[PDB]
Amino acid sequence: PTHLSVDTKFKTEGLCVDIPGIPKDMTYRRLISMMGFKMNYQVNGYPNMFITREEAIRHVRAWIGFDVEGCHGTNLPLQLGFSTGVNLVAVPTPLMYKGLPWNVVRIKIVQMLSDTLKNLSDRVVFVLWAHGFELTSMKYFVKIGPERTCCLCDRRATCFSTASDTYACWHHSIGFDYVYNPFMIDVQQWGFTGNLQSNHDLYCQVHGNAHVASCDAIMTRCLAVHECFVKRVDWTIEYPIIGDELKINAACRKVQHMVVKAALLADKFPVLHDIGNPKAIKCVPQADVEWKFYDAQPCSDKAYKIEELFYSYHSDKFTDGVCLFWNCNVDRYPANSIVCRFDTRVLSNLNLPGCDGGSLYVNKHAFHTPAFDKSAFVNLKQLPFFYYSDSPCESHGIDYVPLKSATCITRCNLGGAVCRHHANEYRLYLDAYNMMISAGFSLWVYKQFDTYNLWNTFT
Numbered sequence: 001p002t003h004l005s006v007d008t009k010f011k012t013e014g015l016c017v018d019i020p021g022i023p024k025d026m027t028y029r030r031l032i033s034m035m036g037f038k039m040n041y042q043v044n045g046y047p048n049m050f051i052t053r054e055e056a057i058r059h060v061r062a063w064i065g066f067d068v069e070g071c072h073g074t075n076l077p078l079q080l081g082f083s084t085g086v087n088l089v090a091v092p093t094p095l096m097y098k099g100l101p102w103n104v105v106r107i108k109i110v111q112m113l114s115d116t117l118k119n120l121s122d123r124v125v126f127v128l129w130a131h132g133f134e135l136t137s138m139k140y141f142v143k144i145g146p147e148r149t150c151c152l153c154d155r156r157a158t159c160f161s162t163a164s165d166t167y168a169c170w171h172h173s174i175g176f177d178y179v180y181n182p183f184m185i186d187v188q189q190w191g192f193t194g195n196l197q198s199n200h201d202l203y204c205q206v207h208g209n210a211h212v213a214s215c216d217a218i219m220t221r222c223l224a225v226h227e228c229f230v231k232r233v234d235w236t237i238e239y240p241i242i243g244d245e246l247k248i249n250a251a252c253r254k255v256q257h258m259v260v261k262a263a264l265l266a267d268k269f270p271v272l273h274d275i276g277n278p279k280a281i282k283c284v285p286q287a288d289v290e291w292k293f294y295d296a297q298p299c300s301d302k303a304y305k306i307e308e309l310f311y312s313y314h315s316d317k318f319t320d321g322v323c324l325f326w327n328c329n330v331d332r333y334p335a336n337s338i339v340c341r342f343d344t345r346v347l348s349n350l351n352l353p354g355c356d357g358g359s360l361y362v363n364k365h366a367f368h369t370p371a372f373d374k375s376a377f378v379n380l381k382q383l384p385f386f387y388y389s390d391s392p393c394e395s396h397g398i399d400y401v402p403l404k405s406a407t408c409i410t411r412c413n414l415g416g417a418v419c420r421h422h423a424n425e426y427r428l429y430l431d432a433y434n435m436m437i438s439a440g441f442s443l444w445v446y447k448q449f450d451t452y453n454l455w456n457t458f459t
């Protein structure tokens with residue numbers, strides 16, 4: 001059971017208004033044939049245009065919602081909407097474009113999917129809430145066949161050119177007119193009562209319905225993301241590396257060790273309450289402090305209510321010492337806390353748009369993160385940048401310019417001039433810090449945190 005069998009049954013009830021008289025008994029094989037495509041018993045890596053919900057989840061970076069509305073059916077114009085917010089109008093003769101023939105519309109479709117997906121995926125997955133016109137319009141911009149490679153590189157082919165008779169990936173498709181071997185999945189097959197809007201609005205209040213096709217394409221993908229990542233969480237699915245994943249993760253660990261280590265030296269808390277990931281380790285292994293752990297998985301729907309984590313009878317007194325919420329998203333953090341919170345609004349190849357203000361962060365694993373909320377940090381302040389090091393001034397073993405900085409908290413800086421070793425390490429730490437902030441993470445600390453208290457930890 002690797003791929004979706006073409007002999008699987010397709011429920012056609014959702015198609016009978018755009019297609020009256022459609023047989024209740026239908027398979028993917030007959031559906032594809034009816035869409036105008038011929039699969040000629042092909043054993044060439046493209047067994048079916050439609051994929052399983054499990055194959056869709058592994059390829060979430062490829063998801064593009066797609067909906068077609070009737071403006072007036074070969075005689076009338078179609079409005080093509082995509083989850084990118086783009087609406088094109090095809091004539092058979094919320095960015096809204098006027099009516100144009102299919103030969104120019106298909107050129108724009110290749111450009112849009114290529115620029116949207118080149119740094120996300122090796123393919124496209126059209127996420128549908130199928131009513132009929134979107135399947136019957138696919139023959140005008142899609143060509144299928146055996147799996148292929150790009151003419152300019154080794155990636156798989158996602159586009160085709162009728163001008164040159166060649167194939168290309170999303171990076172080399174400039175001037176290409178057809179979508180080659182796309183994938184698709186009908187959300188309506190998953191068994192739902194009622195229309196798209198009623199089901200979307202039960203969980204999401206951020207995407208409204210301006211009745212245009214892109215609005216429905218957006219609600220469709222949002223509902224698919226909710227069903228696969230909000231209410232169903234699977235942290236056993238690995239995702240390919242497509243960016244700075246390894247640098248971001250390493251940076252996050254360095255920043256965590258640094259920030260926690262300095263808070264324990266500056267304020268000398270007797271106990272630390274580590275609230276979060278049940279697999280967590282002490283980030284500052286050699287610290288003096290009484291380290292106590294509390295398990296809480298990454299919340300994917302709503303942020304944890306602090307009353308349900310801390311109350312209902314552990315030291316019991318979370319008000320003693322400091323609380324560490326490293327990626328443990330709560331509605332309101334206590335005043336005595338150190339916090340790392342992912343900002344869902346961040347623009348990046350790792351952060352995909354999500355459900356109800358949330359976002360889908362895909363870094364080795366997929367984590368739907370709830371909406372960023374500035375009100376959760378009322379009792380805290382933003383943690384400013386600083387580099388602390390109590391290690392010795394010793395070079396050992398890269399060209400140099402002297403470092404002058406008020407945030408290089410070291411004996412060498414205290415004593416007048418920063419040494420080469422702490423200048424190299426300071427600059428590296430600032431690069432890891434910038435990587436982490438730019439990736440979307442935000443740091444917050446208790447109001448009494450002051451780096452001035454770190455100078456007396458050198459005598």
Ligand SMILES: Cc1cccc(C(=O)N(C)C)c1C
Pocket residue numbers: 118119120121122155240241242243
């Ligand atoms: C953009 C990017 C970068 C590196 C690897 C991939 C990938 O997963 N492929 C299977 C090609 C992608 C899509």
Ligand SMILES: [Zn+2]
Pocket residue numbers: 150151152153154155168169170171172
């Ligand atoms: Zn290529």
Ligand SMILES: [Zn+2]
Pocket residue numbers: 200204205206207218219222223355356
């Ligand atoms: Zn939504």
Ligand SMILES: [Zn+2]
Pocket residue numbers: 392393394410411412413418419420421422
């Ligand atoms: Zn030094």
